[PDB]
Structure formats: C-alpha cells, structure tokens
C-alpha cells in the first residue's frame, strides 16, 4: 500500500461529496431525509450526523497541508448544518420558552423541519416532535465541533438560546419522549415514554456543555454555558435506574449504542456498560444489521402503511421479522476503534461488507434497514436469521440514507486510522479506565471505584444566643454575622439570582425556570455581584413542608444529604454542606438527638460519610467559585441585594370530628372560643375558610394568614395534630413530592395517591408538580383534607427509603400510599392492644418514618403469622421474581388463572408480552386486585408461589381446566379444619384465623396444605411423558 | 497589564454600535430592520449598516491579547458574518430569480431589495416594490469579497461559491441594465421607470473587481472556491461611468450617491 494520504482521503472525499454533502441544503444547511422524492423533511438527528461526517472528513483533511480547500469546505459544511439547526431552533424560541416552564409533547421543540426554508413542517398531532435525543445530540456535537475549532456560535444572543436549550434538557429526567425512533414504544400508541437513550444523551450533552465557552478560543466569561448539576444528576439517576433497559417497554434497544457508545458514551460504570452492551449484542444483533428493538414493526411486511398507530395485538406478529439496521455495525465499529479492541472493528467490518451497496461510481451506500420480504416472513419466524433480506436503500435508485452514509465515513476514517478517536472527541466523552478528574462525569480525583469523599460541613447557628449556648456543649458554630463578608442564602435566593441566566428579550427567553436548587447545587460556592454566597441545603428551609421541623427527620435529612453528596458529587472542589441550627431544634428534648449528630460531625464521620467541620472562611479559601457573571454582563450591578440569612437579634382531642361536624348549629364559632386545644383551633379555622369564604376576618386577622400563623406556631410546640391540619387546609405541597414520585416509577414501581377504599390515582408516568398538586388535593382525597398531608408525608418517607434501602420495597411493585397508611394505621391497632391505639396524625413524622420502617421489614420478627400476612399483604409485597413465576404458571395452564372473579388467561397474555416485561407484572395485580383481605392476598400469593414450585420441579404435570385459586385456598382450608378439629375441635367456622396463624414451614404449615391442594388437582390431569428425565418405569 | 487606551475608547464605540445597530440584529437571521416602522431588512442598508460592526471588529482585533477583547472582536466579526450569511440566505432562497435575471435582465426576475428580518423570506412580491437594485447586490458582493480578504469566513460551501459566481453574472450586465437603483425609485420622476444609474454601474464594477480571482474560502481555499470575473464587463462599466459622470443618469444631473461610487 504505497498510496499517498491525499489519494486515501480523496477516496472518501468523493463519497462525502456525492452521497451526503451533495444533498446539503444551500439555504438552511440541513440534510433532507429523502434524497429522491422531493420530500422537504430534514430531521435534526439525521442532519447532526451528516454534519459529523463532513466534520470527520475535515479532521482527516486537517492532516493534509495541501488540502486544496477541502478542509475549509468540510469544516464549514458542518458549520452550515450546525447553524441551520440553530436557525430552525431559534425560529422556535417561543417553544423553547414554553418547554422550559412546562415540558410536554405539545410544547416541545420540533424535530423535523423544512430542509429548504427551516419552517415548521409537521404539527404535534401528525408527528411526535418530543425527541430529546435531537436537542441533546445538537448540544453534544456543538461542543465537539467548537472544541475541534469549528466556529458555530456567533454572538451572545445565540449563547442565550443555547443556555435555554440546556434548560430544556435539564428537566428531561421527568419528561417522557418519543425517542430517537419518533415512536415511543413498540405499541405505537403515540404515548411518550422515558428512554434511556434520550436521558443518557441529555446526560452526555450536559456534561460536555457545562462551563463550555461557545466562542471557542475567542471566548470570555460571558459565553460559558452553565448547567444545573442536580437536574443533570437526576438525569443520571434516571439513566442508571432505567438501564440496562431502554425503557419500560423495551428491555433493550439499538439506540443504546448511540447512547452508551459514540457519540454520547453516556455510561460511566463499566459493569452496566457491559450488561447493556450484551443485551444489544444478544437480542438485537443480526447478519444484516441490528434490530432497533424486539418486535419492531417499522417498515415490515406485516405493517399497514396507511395506519400511523399499531393495534395492541399487532406487536405479536412483529417477532422475528424486525428490520435489521446496518448502521449499528458502524456504531460497533466506532465503538471498537474508541475502546482499543481491534477484533471488534474487524468483526463488524466483515459484517458491513456484505450489507454494503454501491452507486454507479462504486461509492458505498449503507442501507437504512434490511427487511424480510412478505413471501419470506413465515419462514423467518420459525427459524430467525436464515432467510435473505432486501435492502431499504440500495443506491442507484436515488434514495440514500444520509445518517448511515455519514456514519460510514466516521467509522471508516477511524478504522483506517485517518482520524483519531480523540479528534472526533475533543471534549472527551469516551474516557478509558483511567477514569479520574472529569467534572460532572463520575470521575472525581479518587477515580471510578473509591468514593471516600470529604464534605466540607460548616456549622451555622441562627442567633448568638444559640451560638454561645451550643458552644457551652462543646459544639463550635458561627452565626451569619460572624461569617460576614460571606453571604449565607436560602436556595430560593440562588434561584432568584439564576432567573437572569439566559434571558434574551430579543428572543423572548425568560431565563432559568424557578426550580429549587438541590444539595449538589447548594454545595457549590458562588460569587455573585462581587459577593461570595454559599446557600445552605433546601433541607433546612422551613417553608416547603413541616417535616423539616421534626428534629429526627432533619437529622436523617442531614445524614442522607451527606450520603447523597458523597455519592453524586464529582467536581474538582470539595462540596460545602452548611448546617443550619435553629432555636426550635435545641428547645425541648430535641437537643439530645441534635447534639449527637453535631458531635459526630465534629468527630469527623456521620452516616459513614467523611466530613470536615471547620469555619466557613476555611472551607471557602481555595475552592472553585461559580462566577454568576450573567448578573453583571447585563449591567445589573444595582440589582436588589438578595436577602441573605439574617441572624436573630397536652391531651388527646376532646373534640371528635363527628361530634361537631354533625352539629348543625353555627355556634361552633363560640365553641372555638370555648375550647382551648390547638387541634380544635386548627379545625375551626379550616371550616371558616370553607364555610365563611377564603379571606374572612377573625380576631387575629384574615382567615388565610391566621391558619398560616397557627401552622407555623403549632409546629413550634410540636403539636402534630394542628401542624397536619394546618398544612392540609392550606393545600401545602413541598417541591420534593413530585420528583420523589418520578424516582419511584423509574425504578419500575407504580404509585397510587389516595386513601384506602376511596378513589386512588395511579401515577404510571412522570408528572409535573402542578398536576400532582391537583392530584393530591382535589380529586384524590375529599373525605379528609389531612389525607393529602399524610399522603405527602409517606411519599417523602418512601423517597427517603427507596434510595438508602432499595431492597426494602423489592416485590412491592405498587407503592400505594393509602394502602401503606393502612399498614401503619392497622399496625397501630395491632400494637394498641385492647387500649385506644395511637393516631397516625398524632405521631411525630419521625415515628411515622420509624413505624413505616417497622412495618416494611424483610420479615417482622416473631409476630403472629396472621399479622405478618397482614403486613406483607397490605403492602402487596411479593417474593423476589414472583411475577416471573406467574409466567411459568401461565405457560403451563392452557385455560389460565381465575381468582376472585378476575381471570388471567394463557392468551393473549403470553403472545402479547415478554416474561421479564413490566406490563405483565401490572397485569397480575389487576387480576389480584379483587381480593379484599390483605391476609387473603398473601395466602393466594403464597399459593401462586408453591404451584410455581410444583410446576418448575415437576414439569410432567400440567393443568387441564382453569386454575381457580380460591377453591385451592378453600380446598387446602377445610383440610386444615379437619386436621385441627381432630386435634382440639375448634368451633370457629369459616374463620381464617387458625389457618393464617400457622407458619408455612412446619409440621402442618400452610404451604403443606397448599401443596396438597395443588397436587390433588394437579394429579387430576394427564401426565406428559418428559424426555428430560425419561421415566425409568 | 491593563487594556490599552484604544481598547477603552473602543468600548464607547462598542456601546455606540451596540445601542444603535447591534441591538436590532435579528437573533435568528442576523439581519437588521430599517426602523421600528419599517420592520424589514434592505440588502443595501444591511450591508452598509454592518460596516461599523466590521470596522469595530477589525479595530478590536488589532489588540486581541486578552480573552475579553478577543471575544468582543469575535462577536463583532461573527455578527458581520451572521448578517452577510443571513443576507446570503435571503438571496439564495431566490436562486430562481438569479438564474432568470442572468439571461433576461428584467425587473420581474430581480433579487428582492427587502426581506423578512425574522425568517429570511420575501416580505413583498416581485411587482409590489421596486426590486431591481444592482447596487444593493453589488454592495453585498463588494464587501463579501472585502470581508473575506480581511479574514471573515462567510461563504461556507462550494454551492454558495457557485451562487456567488452566478451572482457575478447577475451584476455583470449593470452597464447595460436599467435598475431602480440606490433610491428604489428609478428615474427622477418616480414613476416605475428603471434607468441606468451610475451608482449601480459603478457599484458592480467595484464588486466585479473585488471578486476578481478572489478565493471565497480565504487563504485555506482552492481553485474551486475562486470567483472568476471577466474584465470585459468590468471595463464596460468604466465606459459607462466615464460617459455618465459627473451625471448619475440621463435624468439626474447629479446624485449624492455618486459619493458611493467615486
Ligand atoms: C417414572 C416416574 C415418574 C416420571 C414420576 C412421575 C411424577 C409424579 C407422579 C409427580 C412427582 C412429584 C414430585 C414433587 C416429586
């Protein structure tokens, strides 16, 4: 091979100029999806990769000094495409503003534009435009090309828009989207659903663009893009939770390679990377390409072209005939070059060569997909991968797949080593196992495996009287005045400061949305307007909700915040955790728990998190300061000084709810004066806002603020009844509930928000704070307003546990709040004995957490088995992998499962879904939902476990008729009676008590009778001679 | 250590340009509306109105040794690129008119004088305005050549090189093509009568000479990016300029726009 490098690059120049650059729009710079046909469609995702292909060849031509002007042509072909997307995006700036405030499928940026004008082409009804992969890839590649030297952003006005694009990407962790495949799921219902590729691309875009000067080398402090760490962190928490699954519907997707490999490399954990790579390699790799996802019917022979949506039963016909996309051989080829594995590069190169097509001039054509013909669909299903597939794009037809053609150039240039992996990755999205010291990218100074992070903990007391009085107990603290030039802020003041970031009155952009700054954001040190400002964590705010006033929860909130920072802080400096102590925390018995935590911080360790207690001036000297320069570039040097933290210079309710609510007379206003309890006040003021209008005048003042005064004042005493009524009758809603729910369902857990026996609303998909506020108060609970406050109490509590003890809710697929609050309220009855038991609204929020933790334990110790089946049954807790065993049951009952009038048939259940699928796990509880007794639920859940035990270890037996488990529960029931009647002749008839109290495993346990019940009916059927162990007789 | 006094006084000029010109630049297109009443961007006015930004950017680039005065130099330079590119898209969206005007030098096939400052589209129709202004495309072509020679990378693709090359043939016949001219009213009568104005003939001659063997990709360009200009049309414009001057046309004894030619 004596070929000069000019001739090697000229080889790709012809392909680039004739196959993708020939079609670049002279006006917009975009690349049309359909090269032949006159279609105006230009997809941002496809156009972005086309820009990379010209950019990749420009990087190759950067090694030729006599480039004959080809480096400039290819560098500025990428710039022309990159700026065209910006032109299209900025023409939709009114949509960027809307998507910032309320991310929705109908308020999002368009992902398809007219290639010749940049106008809007398809509406939200015709096309699913919510594709975060497009915006994230634009931000990612924008960083890549600017870092390589391509000048795309021309002025700060564009910088403001890119900052607003970042804001649209911050919230994506809670925004279901249609994904790269503009489809959402296999079912094609038009339903947005959270994709690992989209959220991972957002994570990749945020990491690359954080602190990135959009001007390149010709840049100053007023072009750097600021990224909220915590929305990035919650984007990564979503990615780590969703993975190795693409989404709820998809166990794997070919879109994962663009996410976990080039160009994003969004996975920083090598275990998961491997897990997620194999499921793509195993369940989607094929001879002709990669299948986008299992049961993908896009452009298949069994698809109706006219219909835009698939039937619920149409996904079954799509198994084994999924279109195979050759583009992912290239993605694996790029992955091989990046990761230093040459066998991977060669292996996927040997697979592309058969699937590659060529033009009349011999230029390679990468087909979009390879589909099995209609004549060969049924042979393919029986034996997959054995029948020939036809190319979607062949060349010589005029139809070219520009995304594939562009990605061909990138992979081949890497394979022939004409461009280095670092050339197309100037900002390092791929980092080798030398994973240290990358900001925002999990690679702190310690590296990828050690996380002994030291958090700088500043002890701040609200007043000197607290300062000296804590000092008398051995704890050194500083009041804000003691730390004087420094300013300690509530996180809200940081949000108010951040409201000016990204404003463009010319584009109508309003800045960063008013969203609370979490722990990692407040862990940073900010310098605003020449004042160094440190914001204490939101956990110390006494406005969002009232469990911050409970000292034990605050102690646990302080602990878990430090563990949260220990786990998710990955910047160069050491995080700053300002601890705020108020006089309410010291007064009363709350000193003893607070002092031990403060002593532990002084000792240097708390919750296993290494901390450093020192003066604020010490923990601020050499740390990196986030310069909020946008607050000065607008010349707002006289902006109002944001309000820094200012130093400060007993019986059960004698009034029953039904006693006076039933009372028709209005004299209860005098009864308000007659009674002396706070709860009686906290109820009397509530009716006065409903009976006598919202803002009626009372002795103290208006009704609206008088209840607010009581709610504030009741918390000071720690009279929890009044603080629960106070927050419930004001429709109080902390900012954490809505993200807490989103955390629940990204773990595979549906959430229902409603009291027992009343209307319960299932939260299938992530929702905005606004609708959940409407959910938790207006529609869900109306019998008692305090139901919502107790409903919101657990949601934070489960939010506390789901992260610290995720195994604790294993099997509990549905976190049903009111069903859970039954478990605590029924436990209080159990613990209450034959005495008036405690009220769940009397317990301090700490006891609410502890009792919740008590009634969740993996196995309550030594309790009545009846009662255990009550605690596990009420929680709807199932064994690990229980939902899987129901398949093996359903796989071997032809007529299905009938329980409590709810039938689970073999078909179409088996044909519709997969046996790791989440949808089936929801289907069982819907079938299981009619069982009213939680204890009766467990014995059925016990039974479905044992019949699975019988079926697995005994594959010869198979059921003939419908498995009616109530009969099997009833059949195993009477055998317990006649056995126990023989023992002592218990006279209770149709009483589950004796049957429930007996342990499963024992001399005569439940599962023994349950086993006998199954076999009696299982032996009522024909046995199948099995060849795994041919019967010796 | 500190900024030079030239940089300090340019800040007052930066404020003057920003408060007067650069604050009206459309975020999307980079174009400049004539005024609040006339919300459209003229090709001739936008090119002329960007000279202060281009001069300021060149003035700031003379001392680009710090991050900030590199960046404001970059902003002013690329704001000029934004406008000249934005004006390129306006004309490149009318390539059918450029192709038709090359063969038939009619007013009905001329590049529009005014465009949508927000979308780079034609605000008015081919007959609702006096559109044939060969000194508006030439003021673009002349400065496009000059701004590329100064280092501003405006043309990005070889297709735009072909477009600018075809724009040369658009302004080649300025010596033999009557146009409305710099004042969009044609003859002195203002009756829709196009006339041979020396401003259009002069402007095309300078634009043709400016584009003569000019590499639109700058120094990092090749023969594919070179605009070829024929001196026959360049010196034919001279034969008209010498005959017309000191008159601006047969209908005007003089025009102050000839200051834009002499
Ligand atoms: C040749 C004999 C056999 C193949 C045994 C048939 C199996 C059964 C009658 C049920 C056995 C069940 C167990 C739980 C061991």
Swiss-Prot record, chain A:
Residue numbers spanned by region Calmodulin-binding: 709-736, 861-892
One GO molecular-function entry: calmodulin binding
Disease note: Glycogen storage disease 9B: A metabolic disorder characterized by hepatomegaly, only slightly elevated transaminases and plasma lipids, clinical improvement with increasing age, and remarkably no clinical muscle involvement. Biochemical observations suggest that this mild phenotype is caused by an incomplete holoenzyme that lacks the beta subunit, but that may possess residual activity.
Family: Belongs to the phosphorylase b kinase regulatory chain family.
GO cellular-component term (any): cytosol
Name under which the protein is recorded: Phosphorylase b kinase regulatory subunit beta
Covalent lipid adducts (S-farnesyl cysteine), residues: 1031
PANTHER family per record: PHOSPHORYLASE B KINASE REGULATORY SUBUNIT, PHOSPHORYLASE B KINASE REGULATORY SUBUNIT BETA
Main location per the UniProt record: membrane
Topology class, membrane: Lipid-anchor
Record's subunit section: Hexadecamer of 4 heterotetramers, each composed of alpha, beta, gamma, and delta subunits. Alpha (PHKA1 or PHKA2) and beta (PHKB) are regulatory subunits, gamma (PHKG1 or PHKG2) is the catalytic subunit, and delta is calmodulin.
Localization terms from the record: Cell membrane
SUPFAM superfamilies reported for this sequence: Six-hairpin glycosidases
UniProtKB/Swiss-Prot annotation, chain B:
UniProt subcellular location: Cell membrane
Post-translational modification: Although the final Cys may be farnesylated, the terminal tripeptide is probably not removed, and the C-terminus is not methylated.
Expressing tissues: Muscle specific. Isoform 1 is predominant in vastus lateralis muscle. Isoform 2 predominates slightly in heart, and it predominates clearly in the other tissues tested.
Disease: Glycogen storage disease 9D: A metabolic disorder characterized by slowly progressive, predominantly distal muscle weakness and atrophy. Clinical features include exercise intolerance with early fatigability, pain, cramps and occasionally myoglobinuria.
Subunit structure: Hexadecamer of 4 heterotetramers, each composed of alpha, beta, gamma, and delta subunits. Alpha (PHKA1 or PHKA2) and beta (PHKB) are regulatory subunits, gamma (PHKG1 or PHKG2) is the catalytic subunit, and delta is calmodulin.
Family of the protein in this entry: Belongs to the phosphorylase b kinase regulatory chain family.
Biological role: Phosphorylase b kinase catalyzes the phosphorylation of serine in certain substrates, including troponin I. The alpha chain may bind calmodulin.
Name of the protein described by the UniProt record: Phosphorylase b kinase regulatory subunit alpha, skeletal muscle isoform
Originating gene: PHKA1
Residues of the full protein shown: 2 to 263 of 1223
């Amino acid at each position: 091979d004596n070929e000069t490098l000019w001739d090697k690059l000229d080889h790709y120049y012809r392909i680039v100029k004739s196959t993708l650059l020939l079609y670049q729009s002279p006006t917009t710079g975009l690349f049309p999806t359909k090269t032949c046909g006159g279609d105006q469609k230009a997809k941002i995702q496809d156009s972005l990769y086309c820009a990379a292909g010209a950019w990749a060849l420009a990087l190759a031509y950067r090694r030729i000094d006599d480039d004959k002007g080809r480096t400039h042509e290819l560098e500025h072909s990428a710039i022309k495409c990159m700026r065209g997307i910006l032109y299209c995006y900025m023409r939709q700036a009114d949509k960027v503003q809307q998507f910032k405030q309320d991310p929705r499928p109908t308020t999002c940026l368009h992902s398809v534009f007219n290639v010749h004008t940049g106008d809007e082409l398809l509406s939200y009804e015709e096309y699913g435009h919510l594709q975060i992969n497009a915006v994230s890839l634009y931000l990612l590649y924008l960083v890549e090309m600017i870092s390589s030297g391509l000048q795309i952003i021309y002025n700060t006005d564009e910088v403001s828009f890119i900052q607003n694009l970042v804001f649209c990407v911050e919230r994506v962790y809670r925004v279901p989207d249609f994904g790269v495949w503009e489809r959402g799921s296999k079912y094609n219902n038009g339903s947005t659903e959270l994709h690992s590729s989209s959220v991972g691309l957002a994570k990749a875009a945020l990491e690359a663009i954080n602190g990135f000067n959009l001007f390149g080398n010709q840049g100053c402090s007023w072009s750097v893009i600021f990224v909220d760490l915590d929305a990035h962190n919650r984007n990564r928490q979503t990615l780590c939770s969703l993975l190795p699954r693409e989404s709820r519907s998809h166990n794997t997707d070919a879109a994962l390679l663009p996410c976990i490999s080039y160009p994003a490399f969004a996975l920083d954990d090598e275990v998961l990377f491997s897990q997620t790579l194999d499921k793509v390699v195993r369940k989607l790799k094929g001879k002709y390409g990669f299948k986008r996802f299992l049961r993908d019917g896009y452009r298949t022979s069994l698809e109706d072209p006219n219909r835009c949506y698939y039937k619920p039963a149409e996904i079954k016909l799509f198994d084994g005939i999924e279109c195979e996309f050759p583009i992912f051989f290239l993605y694996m080829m790029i992955d091989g070059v990046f990761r230093g594995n040459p066998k991977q590069v060669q292996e996927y190169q040997d697979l592309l060569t058969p699937v590659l097509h060529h033009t009349t001039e011999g230029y390679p054509v990468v087909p979009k997909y390879y589909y099995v013909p209609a004549d060969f669909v049924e042979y393919e299903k029986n034996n997959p991968g054995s029948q020939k597939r036809f190319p979607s794009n062949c060349g010589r037809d005029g139809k070219l797949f520009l995304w594939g053609q562009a990605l061909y150039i990138i992979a081949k240039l890497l394979a022939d080593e004409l461009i280095s992996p670092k050339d197309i990755d100037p900002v390092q999205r791929y980092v080798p196992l030398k994973d240290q010291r990358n900001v925002s990218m999990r690679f702190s100074n310690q590296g990828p495996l050690e996380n002994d992070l030291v958090v700088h903990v500043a002890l701040i007391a609200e007043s000197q009287r607290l300062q000296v009085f804590l000092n008398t107990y051995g704890i050194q603290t500083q009041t804000p005045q003691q730390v004087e030039p420094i300013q300690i802020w509530p996180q809200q003041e940081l949000v108010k400061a951040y409201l000016q970031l990204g404003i463009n009155e010319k584009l109508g952009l309003s800045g960063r949305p008013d969203r609370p700054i979490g722990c990692l954001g407040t862990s940073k040190i900010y310098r605003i307007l020449g004042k160094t400002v440190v914001c204490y964590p939101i956990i110390f705010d006494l406005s969002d909700f009232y469990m911050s006033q409970d000292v034990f929860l605050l102690i646990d909130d302080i602990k878990n915040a430090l563990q949260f920072i220990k786990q998710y802080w990955k910047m160069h400096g050491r995080p700053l955790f300002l601890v705020l102590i108020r006089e309410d925390n010291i007064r009363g018995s709350r000193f003893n728990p607070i002092l031990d935590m403060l002593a532990a911080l002084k000792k240097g360790i708390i919750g296993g998190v290494k901390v450093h207690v020192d003066r604020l001036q010490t923990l601020i000297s050499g740390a990196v300061v986030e310069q909020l320069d946008f607050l000065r570039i607008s010349d707002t040097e006289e902006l109002p000084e944001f309000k820094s933290f200012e130093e400060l210079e007993g019986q059960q309710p004698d009034v029953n709810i039904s006693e006076w609510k039933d009372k028709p007379t209005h004299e209860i206003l005098q009864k308000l004066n007659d009674c002396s309890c706070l709860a009686s006040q906290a109820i009397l003021l509530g009716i006065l806002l409903k009976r006598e209008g919202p803002n009626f005048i009372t002795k103290e003042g208006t009704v609206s603020d008088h209840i607010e005064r009581v709610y504030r004042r009741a918390g000071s005493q720690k009279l929890w009844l009044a603080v629960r009524y106070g927050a419930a009758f004001t429709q109080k809603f902390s900012s954490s509930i809505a993200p807490h729910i989103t955390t629940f369902l990204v773990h595979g857990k549906q959430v229902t928000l409603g009291a027992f026996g009343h209307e319960e609303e299932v939260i299938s998909n992530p929702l905005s704070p606004r609708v959940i506020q409407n959910i938790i108060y207006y529609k869900c609970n109306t019998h008692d307003e305090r139901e919502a406050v107790i409903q919101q109490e657990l949601v934070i509590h489960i939010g506390w546990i789901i992260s610290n003890n995720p195994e604790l809710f294993s099997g509990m697929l549905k976190i049903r709040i009111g069903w859970i609050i039954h478990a605590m309220e029924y436990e209080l009855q159990i613990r209450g004995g034959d005495k008036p038991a405690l009220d769940l609204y009397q317990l301090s929020p700490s006891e609410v957490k502890q009792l919740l933790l008590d009634i969740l334990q993996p196995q309550q110790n030594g309790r009545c088995w009846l009662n255990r089946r009550q605690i596990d049954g009420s929680l709807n807790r199932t064994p690990t992998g229980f939902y899987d065993r129901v398949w093996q049951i359903l796989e071997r009952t032809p007529n299905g499962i009938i329980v409590a009038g709810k039938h689970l048939p073999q078909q179409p259940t088996l044909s519709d879904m997969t046996m790791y699928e989440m949808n089936f796990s929801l289907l069982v509880e819907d079938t299981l939902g009619n069982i009213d007794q939680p204890q009766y639920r467990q014995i059925v859940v016990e039974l479905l476990m044992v019949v699975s035990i019988v079926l697995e270890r005994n594959p010869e037996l198979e059921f003939q008729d419908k498995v009616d488990l109530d009969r099997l529960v009833k059949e195993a029931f009477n055998e317990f009676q006649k056995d126990q009647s023989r023992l002592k002749e218990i006279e209770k008839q149709d009483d589950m008590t004796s049957f429930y109290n007996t342990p499963p495993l024992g001399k005569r346990g439940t599962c023994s009778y349950l086993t006998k019940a199954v076999m009696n009916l299982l032996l009522e059927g024909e046995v199948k001679p099995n060849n795994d162990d041919p019967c010796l007789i | 250590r500190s900024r030079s006094n030239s940089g300090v006084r340019l800040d007052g000029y930066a404020r003057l340009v920003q408060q007067t010109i650069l604050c009206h630049q459309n975020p999307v297109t980079g174009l400049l509306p004539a005024s609040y009443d006339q919300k459209d961007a003229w090709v001739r006015d936008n090119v002329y109105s960007i000279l202060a930004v281009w001069g300021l950017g060149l003035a700031y680039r003379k001392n680009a040794d710090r991050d900030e005065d590199k960046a404001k130099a970059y902003e002013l330079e690329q704001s000029v690129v934004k406008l000249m590119r934005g004006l390129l898209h306006c004309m490149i969206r009318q390539v059918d008119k450029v192709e038709s005007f090359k063969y038939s030098q009619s007013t009905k096939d001329s590049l529009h004088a005014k465009y949508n400052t927000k979308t780079c589209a034609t605000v008015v129709g081919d007959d609702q305005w006096g559109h044939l202004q060969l000194d508006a495309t030439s003021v673009y072509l002349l400065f496009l050549a000059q701004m590329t020679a100064s280092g501003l990378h405006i043309i990005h693709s070889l297709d735009e090189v072909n477009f600018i090359q075809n724009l040369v043939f658009y302004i080649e016949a300025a010596y033999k093509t009557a146009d409305f001219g710099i004042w969009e009213r044609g003859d002195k009568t203002n009756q829709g009568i196009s006339e041979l104005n020396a401003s259009s003939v002069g402007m095309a001659k300078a634009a043709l000479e400016a584009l003569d063997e000019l590499d639109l990709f700058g120094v990092k360009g090749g023969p594919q990016s070179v605009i070829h200009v024929l001196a026959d049309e360049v010196q034919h414009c001279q034969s008209i300029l010498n005959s017309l001057l000191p008159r601006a046309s047969t209908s005007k004894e003089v025009d102050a726009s000839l200051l834009s030619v002499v």
